[PDB]
Amino acid sequence: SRFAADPHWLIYLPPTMSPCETSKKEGMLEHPIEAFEYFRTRGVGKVVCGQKHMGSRAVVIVCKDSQVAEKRFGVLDGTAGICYTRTGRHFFDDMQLEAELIDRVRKVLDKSGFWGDFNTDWVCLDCELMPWSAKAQKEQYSAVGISGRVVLDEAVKLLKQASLNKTVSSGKNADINELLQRFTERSEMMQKYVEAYRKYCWPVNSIDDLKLAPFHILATEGKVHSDKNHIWHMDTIAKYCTQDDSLIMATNHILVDVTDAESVDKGIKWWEDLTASGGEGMVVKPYDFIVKNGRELLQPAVKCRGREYLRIIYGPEYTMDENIERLRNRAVGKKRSLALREFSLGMEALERFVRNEPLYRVHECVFGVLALESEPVDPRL
Amino acid sequence: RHMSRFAADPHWLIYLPPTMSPCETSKKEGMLEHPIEAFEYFRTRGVGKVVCGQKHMGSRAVVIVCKDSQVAEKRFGVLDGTAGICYTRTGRHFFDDMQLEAELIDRVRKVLDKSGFWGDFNTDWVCLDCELMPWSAKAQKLLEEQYSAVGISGRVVLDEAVKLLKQASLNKNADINELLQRFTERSEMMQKYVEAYRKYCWPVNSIDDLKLAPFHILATEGKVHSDKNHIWHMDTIAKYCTQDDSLIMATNHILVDVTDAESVDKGIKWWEDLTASGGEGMVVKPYDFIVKNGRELLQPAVKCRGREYLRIIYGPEYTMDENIERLRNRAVGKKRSLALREFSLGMEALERFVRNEPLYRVHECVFGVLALESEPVDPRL
Ligand SMILES: Nc1ncnc2c1ncn2[C@@H]1O[C@H](COP(=O)(O)OP(=O)(O)OP(=O)(O)O)[C@@H](O)[C@H]1O
Numbered sequence: 054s055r056f057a058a059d060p061h062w063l064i065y066l067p068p069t070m071s072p073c074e075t076s077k078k079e080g081m082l083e084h085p086i087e088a089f090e091y092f093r094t095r096g097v098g099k100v101v102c103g104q105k106h107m108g109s110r111a112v113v114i115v116c117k118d119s120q121v122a123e124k125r126f127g128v129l130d131g132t133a134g135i136c137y138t139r140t141g142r143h144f145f146d147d148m149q150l151e152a153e154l155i156d157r158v159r160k161v162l163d164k165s166g167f168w169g170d171f172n173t174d175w176v177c178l179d180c181e182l183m184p185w186s187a188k189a190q191k192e193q194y195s196a197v198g199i200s201g202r203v204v205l206d207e208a209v210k211l212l213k214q215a216s217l218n219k220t221v222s223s224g225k226n227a228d229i230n231e232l233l234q235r236f237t238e239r240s241e242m243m244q245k246y247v248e249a250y251r252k253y254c255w256p257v258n259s260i261d262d263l264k265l266a267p268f269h270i271l272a273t274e275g276k277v278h279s280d281k282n283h284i285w286h287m288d289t290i291a292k293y294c295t296q297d298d299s300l301i302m303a304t305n306h307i308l309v310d311v312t313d314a315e316s317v318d319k320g321i322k323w324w325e326d327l328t329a330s331g332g333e334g335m336v337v338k339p340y341d342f343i344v345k346n347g348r349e350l351l352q353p354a355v356k357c358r359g360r361e362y363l364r365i366i367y368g369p370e371y372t373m374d375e376n377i378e379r380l381r382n383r384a385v386g387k388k389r390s391l392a393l394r395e396f397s398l399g400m401e402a403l404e405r406f407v408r409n410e411p412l413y414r415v416h417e418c419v420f421g422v423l424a425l426e427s428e429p430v431d432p433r434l
Numbered sequence: 435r436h437m438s439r440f441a442a443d444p445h446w447l448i449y450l451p452p453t454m455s456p457c458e459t460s461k462k463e464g465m466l467e468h469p470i471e472a473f474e475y476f477r478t479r480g481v482g483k484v485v486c487g488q489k490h491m492g493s494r495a496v497v498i499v500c501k502d503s504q505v506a507e508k509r510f511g512v513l514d515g516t517a518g519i520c521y522t523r524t525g526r527h528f529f530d531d532m533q534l535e536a537e538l539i540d541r542v543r544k545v546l547d548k549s550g551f552w553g554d555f556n557t558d559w560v561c562l563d564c565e566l567m568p569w570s571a572k573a574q575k576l577l578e579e580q581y582s583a584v585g586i587s588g589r590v591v592l593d594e595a596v597k598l599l600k601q602a603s604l605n606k607n608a609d610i611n612e613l614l615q616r617f618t619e620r621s622e623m624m625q626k627y628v629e630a631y632r633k634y635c636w637p638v639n640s641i642d643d644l645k646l647a648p649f650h651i652l653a654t655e656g657k658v659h660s661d662k663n664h665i666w667h668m669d670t671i672a673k674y675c676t677q678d679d680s681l682i683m684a685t686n687h688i689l690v691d692v693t694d695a696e697s698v699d700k701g702i703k704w705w706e707d708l709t710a711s712g713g714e715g716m717v718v719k720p721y722d723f724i725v726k727n728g729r730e731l732l733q734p735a736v737k738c739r740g741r742e743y744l745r746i747i748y749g750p751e752y753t754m755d756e757n758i759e760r761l762r763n764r765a766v767g768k769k770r771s772l773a774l775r776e777f778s779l780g781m782e783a784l785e786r787f788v789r790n791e792p793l794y795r796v797h798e799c800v801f802g803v804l805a806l807e808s809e810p811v812d813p814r815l
């Protein structure tokens with residue numbers, strides 16, 4: 054809401070993800086071949102493909118009880134867990150709804166004997182939370198009184214007038230127009246998301262209406278599980294989390310040998326099936342959580358979105374020409390380096406927290422991710 | 435000259451009002467605009483008498499009313515089943531909410547019904563030039579007066595604009611909530627500003643929150659009324675729209691003998707008490723709708739804004755010694771050129787409509803106005 058969650062919970066923030074390079078196939082922006090190729094040509098023989106759920110990114114921390122939260126995290130709140138977003142805010146404004154979700158996850162972990170097997174009284178999870186409309190967003194095209202765009206036009210006029218006043222003085226034109234663009238583009242971009250996700254949204258009237266799909270066991274007491282491969286993650290999660298309660302989802306995923314023509318072809322067909330109706334697509338990850346070709350760090354994940362979906366996001370009547378394709382590949386380049394830095398910051402933050410370092414040291418890294426996500430990037434990516 | 439901005443049936447777009455020039459810079463001290471200059475402009479061009487209307491907080495509104503949806507389709511060629519429209523100088527719908535627009539048109543319609551306007555004009559439609567103004571339902575007075583009463587003005591909003599300009603031009607230890615503020619999306623900044631602008635200027639939830647002040651009966655079946663003086667427009671409007679429905683309000687106006695020292699003193703004082711109370715100022719018009727002095731067309735109107743109101747537009751510190759430039763007078767020159775050109779396009783649009791020229795011939799003039807409003811010019815004028 055107006056405020057972040059208690060900073061004591063914020064031990065981690067997920068990194069941005071890179072798309073694949075522009076496909077050479079006609080009418081295609083992205084295609085699995087580019088994703089698999091990136092890994093094949095960098096020494097990775099096996100990758101794991103996960104189905105994109107089409108919800109929102111959520112970090113979920115669960116403690117056995119309030120006593121654990123207070124002692125371990127210094128949370129003086131009375132809470133025994135949290136489900137927070139990407140900017141460190143609570144996913145829900147209803148703390149009761151959040152607590153129910155946490156309780157549901159706790160019960161599942163009780164029955165599966167997770168605590169005992171992991172020798173921990175808390176867990177941090179990287180998740181997707183569905184449905185997409187369950188989060189808060191919100192709109193100037195259906196105003197209550199005066200039309201949104203008229204009010205915008207008028208407010209913009211006064212902005213321009215105010216510019217001519219001498220307060221701060223440096224001689225370049227008013228970037229008010231560049232600024233009105235970032236605003237309308239944001240709006241037109243949001244309109245597109247609504248259209249792409251509308252089919253995958255349903256009202257939530259209770260916790261029963263939610264779906265949580267965890268894909269990472271980030272950390273438990275005394276260990277960050279960045280040393281475990283995604284198959285371990287997928288199945289451990291399925292074993293401890295998905296058996297008892299339909300609230301928690303397993304993630305449809307496949308293994309692909311990026312050197313095997315047959316395995317790759319099964320991967321492509323798998324992806325084609327996911328995105329046939331406009332599904333978002335898949336995330337392609339190296340078999341291992343962390344891989345290094347030479348000392349070059351490799352993308353921990355590459356997203357590969359469906360034709361129908363990208364059609365909506367980019368606009369149906371949208372064409373890519375040379376130079377634009379060239380610009381897209383450059384931008385993909387920026388996103389890559391950015392993803393790596395954020396990825397590492399988030400890993401170090403968890404590591405520092407696991408080693409019981411001062412909270413401000415953990416926040417050095419957690420906040421760094423936040424700062425990096427402030428930089429302007431192409432939203433369609 | 436766009437239609438995504440209009441959003442309405444293009445058949446309604448038979449007119450756009452012209453921009454308006456301010457008066458020559460006053461020679462008085464601490465004054466940028468004074469009624470003397472407005473009066474002088476008209477005196478030295480053969481206009482002996484002028485009409486002064488109070489300039490209210492609000493926006494120029496074009497309002498077209500047909501008796502019913504059938505007249506709309508037959509006379510205007512409208513296809514969406516509406517029977518009237520309220521739109522801005524920029525050709526945009528005033529409301530995102532069609533029912534709200536419909537209620538406003540219907541109110542005006544009923545008033546024309548009661549007065550027997552249709553019969554006395556032998557028309558089933560009318561095009562009105564108006565101002566739309568925020569109205570405090572609770573206090574039963576203009577929102578403007580309500581603010582005025584506690585020394586509140588548009589400085590509130592100017593301050594916001596100024597915050598935005600500085601915040602956009604930018605880049606115990608770390609506080610997460612300070613960081614979230616600091617990393618506020620540039621798109622979010624703009625959004626908060628527009629919302630603050632709506633809150634001050636247009637806190638409107640329904641028709642009870644608005645007034646309409648018509649000042650020109652532009653056109654009715656078979657006749658554009660540019661041949662009738664502004665006293666005729668004010669009288670006729672008072673007779674046919676001002677008697678009943680409280681939605682339609684009369685515009686406070688006086689009349690000045692520009693060659694008479696006593697009459698001028700009365701008008702100056704009228705303006706001073708008007709502006710001293712917080713008023714934006716006045717609009718000075720020639721007695722006739724169209725005056726041409728020796729093959730030269732006069733400004734159809736000149737605005738004269740109050741000293742305190744001009745601090746919002748020019749900056750609070752404009753008065754002290756920046757007042758000496760002021761050499762803007764040439765700036766007022768380009769503005770004056772656009773005014774005449776736009777004015778002529780608008781009367782031509784109406785004349786073509788009234789003589790049943792094809793829609794595109796009408797639109798050629800209307801879009802011409804938009805195109806001229808698109809030329810760079812000092813926004814404070
Ligand atoms: N009695 C009147 N006759 C003519 N114009 C009037 C009158 N009273 C108020 N006005 C307003 O003053 C306007 C132009 O001056 P100003 O620079 O303040 O307005 P603006 O901010 O361009 O936009 P708007 O035209 O939306 O009011 C006219 O468009 C009109 O709404």
Ligand SMILES: Nc1ncnc2c1ncn2[C@@H]1O[C@H](COP(=O)(O)OP(=O)(O)O)[C@@H](O)[C@H]1O
Nearest residue numbers: 069070103104105106109110181268304336434
């Ligand atoms: N199986 C999965 N593994 C990893 N990430 C996933 C998976 N399913 C969905 N995602 C989501 O895909 C997102 C990428 O979404 P996107 O809207 O492209 O954001 P960004 O530009 O910040 O990367 C991640 O933030 C994550 O929330």
